[PDB]
Amino acid sequence: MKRTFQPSVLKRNRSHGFRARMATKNGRQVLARRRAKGRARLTVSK
Amino acid sequence: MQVILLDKVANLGSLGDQVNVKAGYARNFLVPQGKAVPATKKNIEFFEARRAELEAKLAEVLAAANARAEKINALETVTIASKAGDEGKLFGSIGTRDIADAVTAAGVEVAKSEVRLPNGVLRTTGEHEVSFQVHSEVFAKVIVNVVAE
Amino acid sequence: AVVKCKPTSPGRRHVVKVVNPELHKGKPFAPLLEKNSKSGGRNNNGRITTRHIGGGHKQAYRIVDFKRNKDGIPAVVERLEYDPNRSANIALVLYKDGERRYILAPKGLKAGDQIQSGVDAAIKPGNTLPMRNIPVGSTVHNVEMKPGKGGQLARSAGTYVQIVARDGAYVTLRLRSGEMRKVEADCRATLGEVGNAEHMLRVLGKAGAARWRGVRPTVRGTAMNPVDHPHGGGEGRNFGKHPVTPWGVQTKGKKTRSNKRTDKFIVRRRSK
Amino acid sequence: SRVCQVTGKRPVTGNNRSHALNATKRRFLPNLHSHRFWVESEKRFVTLRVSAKGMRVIDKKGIDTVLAELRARGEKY
RNA sequence: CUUUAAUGUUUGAUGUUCUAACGUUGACCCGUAAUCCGGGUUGCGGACAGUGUCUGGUGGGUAGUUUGACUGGGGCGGUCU
RNA sequence: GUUUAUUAAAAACACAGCACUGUGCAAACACGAAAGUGGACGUAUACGGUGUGACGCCUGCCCGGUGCCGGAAGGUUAAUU
RNA sequence: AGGACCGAACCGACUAAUGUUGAAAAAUUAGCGGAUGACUUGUGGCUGGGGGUGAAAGGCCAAUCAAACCGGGAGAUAGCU
């Protein structure tokens, strides 16, 4: 029947981008570990 | 906390000599009107010198409440003008802010503050009995007479 | 009046509505319409914390004057309307001084009648008085709790908190809660019943009337599992514990009161 | 917060050690009286966060030192 | 000594009461033609609810564990020196 | 109408009503370090939770135990003076 | 008017035939019920794992639910194979 992934990129952008997570401490440590690993897609919001 | 208590009246009062007291008497009841000096042990020997000079002057500042105890315990009409409705309704009333500051007890303030008042005062023009704070601990009657502005 | 349905289908068998020929069958005039919105029982956390409140129709909100206090300015009473946010009807009262309010209905609704205040002036229903100057046997509209706290008691349609003594320094009145209080005479209160006295002839007759009122359905505790609710039962329901809430409180017990600030005025309370 | 502005004390770690001697944590909490005072030099009311046995601390040190840390904190009153 | 009056004396308990601490998802002015916040005032409660420290009763509402071997497999049963 | 996405789809679940009870509104309740907010900015002809299940005729005995409320004259009684 | 109805479009799937190393996340074909509503439902948003949210099945929570996922603790421990 219906599958678990569906269209809307809107529900991604404010959960899982940059500027609103950098504003917090904890958001910066997700971003720190990801930059330090060497992953090229930093938020996948591109 | 201890202080050096400068009052002479009420439940505690030793006129400038140090006597250690509970902490609700110390500072918060007396210093909103500058009636104690701290037991800080930097100046306490000077304070016990200073009293010998100070007290006879300080005793006349402590003849302020005696007036109030004279002038309200033998009552007369405290005349207050307040804003009347067309049927004499005191919308505004006297309440706490006119009973504090214009009363003839000492012709001065007793700090307006919080009051217990288990029901109103003053609700139509004319005279009425009003039981209010002639002193911080002591609830007593004055008689009021209200006229229109 | 009341309109009861002829039982032309199941679920419409016991359905009853409140109607009055005078009711405005429009939508209210919107520049003066002051926006409800619901929180559907969700608090700051983004969690549901008052359980089973949630859903239904939008139900707009009017500011309402809940003391009805006014010196001597006449009111034309421009319409009496159904209010979606409480039991009682709410008037648009239009005063002749050019002031529009919304105001809670009293037993009064008279065209051109005046809301007076002060002792010698006030006597028609809806005209405010200090409680000293109102007679014994009076039903009273909207009681001031302490002077300046406003009319917090008897607000829902046709209810009252009736004066039953007046001896001493206080006035004694009984509440439809079973409570009986003393209240000081310096409080303001107002004449007549609360308006919309016919509300009580509602019978609802379908689960959907409470659904649009933002009241959600609620399961039996004994029909939930022991893990999902502290009472919950086994294989074939097995009712036979003592009944409980989902948080461990006794449903047929407790006096939970700890307000301890207005308690000098309650001279008898509801009791287990 | 729950800071006693006058001694610079705070809650601190400590285990129960119950009647069966169990090491469940409870942690100990200062009584932390949120207390008003008067200042003659400003002719205003100030609020200083005090604890139990905190009143004798304000007396013996002086209000003045405590009051200067409220100025240092940046807060309004 | 028991009951006990007069009453010297220290401390624990009590009632009634004030506002002066303390309370205010009461209201008003004000910062501020900011529903917050904070001081003030005013309505009302009040040295009490409160909270901490100390300690005892109640309490599966909640969470972590626990609930025999032997034994012609055994549950159960019966027994353990 | 709801239902274990794919064993029921109903004998379970819901509901008006019907019985029990909490709550006087800073409510009962809830979640959150706690501020706090939702309930509801409504408020007993209202709101939570509980048992029963529209409607006609009804529901006799009984709190013992189980959970839970509350009151008092007082013998003793931790902590404590 | 209607928590009414027969019924497409629109949505579901009580039962039956089939499928079961299917085309399939129970779909298909036929009987069948909601669709003038407690229906069907697009957009933007939110609560984070014995925690949520439940008209109740201990349901559902990223092709998944009587215990989601990952990164550390971690070479858990094993009285045992």
Describe the protein's architecture and organization.
The structure is cut from a larger assembly and holds chains A (46 residues), B (149 residues), C (272 residues) and D (77 residues). Chain A is mainly α. Chain A is 52% helix and 0% strand. Chain A has three helices and no strands. In chain A, 0% of the residues are buried. In chain B, strand 4 and strand 5 form a beta hairpin. The termini of chain B are far apart. Chain B has a three-stranded mixed sheet. Chain B is 23% helix and 21% strand. Chain B has a domain at 69-148: Roll (Ribosomal Protein L9, domain 2). In chain C, the strands form six sheets. Chain C has a four-stranded antiparallel sheet, with no helix packed on it. A three-stranded antiparallel sheet of chain C has the order 4-5-6, with no helix packed on it. Chain C is an all-beta fold and 272 residues long. Chain C is built from one helix and 15 strands, in the order ββββββββββββββαβ. Chain D has a single domain (1-77), classed as Ribosomal protein L28/L24 (Ribosomal Protein L24e, Chain: T, Roll), CATH 2.30.170.40. Chain D contains two helices and two strands, in the order E-E-H-H. Chain D has helices at residues 54-61, 63-73, and strands spanning 34-39, 44-49. The two termini of chain D are 17 Å apart. Chains in contact: B-C, B-D. Chain B binds chain C through residues 85-89, 91, 118-120, 123-124, and chain C through 71-72, 117-121, 130, 132, 147, 169-170, 184-186, 264. Chain C binds three RNA strands through helix 1. Chain C: InterPro entries: NA-bd_OB-fold (IPR012340), Rib_uL2_dom2 (IPR014722), Ribosomal_uL2 (IPR002171), Ribosomal_uL2_bac/org-type (IPR005880), Ribosomal_uL2_C (IPR022669), Ribosomal_uL2_CS (IPR022671), Ribosomal_uL2_dom3 (IPR014726), Ribosomal_uL2_RNA-bd_dom (IPR022666). Chain C: One of its GO terms (molecular function) is RNA binding. Chain C: The modification N6-acetyllysine is found at residue 241.
Q: Which properties best describe this structure?
A:
part of a larger assembly, 4 chains, C: 272 residues, mainly beta, 4-stranded antiparallel sheet, 3-stranded antiparallel sheet, 1 helix, globular, D: 77 residues, alpha+beta, Ribosomal Protein L24e, Chain: T, 25% helix, elongated, RNA-binding, acetylation (chain B), Ribosomal_bL9/RNase_H1_N (chain B), Ribosomal_bL9_bac/chp (chain B), ribonucleoprotein (chain B)
Specify the biggest β-sheet of chain D: 2 strands, antiparallel
Radius of gyration of chain C: 22 Å
Number of helices of chain C: 1
- What is the helix fraction of residues of chain D, given as a range? 10-25%
Distance between the termini of chain C: 38 Å
Q: Biggest β-sheet of chain C: count, sense, barrel?
A: 4 strands, antiparallel
Q: From the 3D coordinates, which CATH architecture of chain D would you assign?
A: Roll
Query: What share of residues of chain C is helical?
Result: under 10%
Which chains have the largest interface? B-C, 11 and 16 residues
Query: Can you tell me the CATH superfamily of chain D?
Result: Ribosomal protein L28/L24
Distinct helical segment count of chain D = 2
InterPro entries (chain B): Ribosomal_bL9, Ribosomal_bL9/RNase_H1_N, Ribosomal_bL9_bac/chp, Ribosomal_bL9_C, Ribosomal_bL9_C_sf, Ribosomal_bL9_N, Ribosomal_bL9_N_sf
Keywords (chain B): Acetylation, Ribonucleoprotein, Ribosomal protein, RNA-binding, rRNA-binding
Protein name (chain B): Large ribosomal subunit protein bL9
Function (chain B): One of the primary rRNA binding proteins, it binds very close to the 3' end of the 23S rRNA.
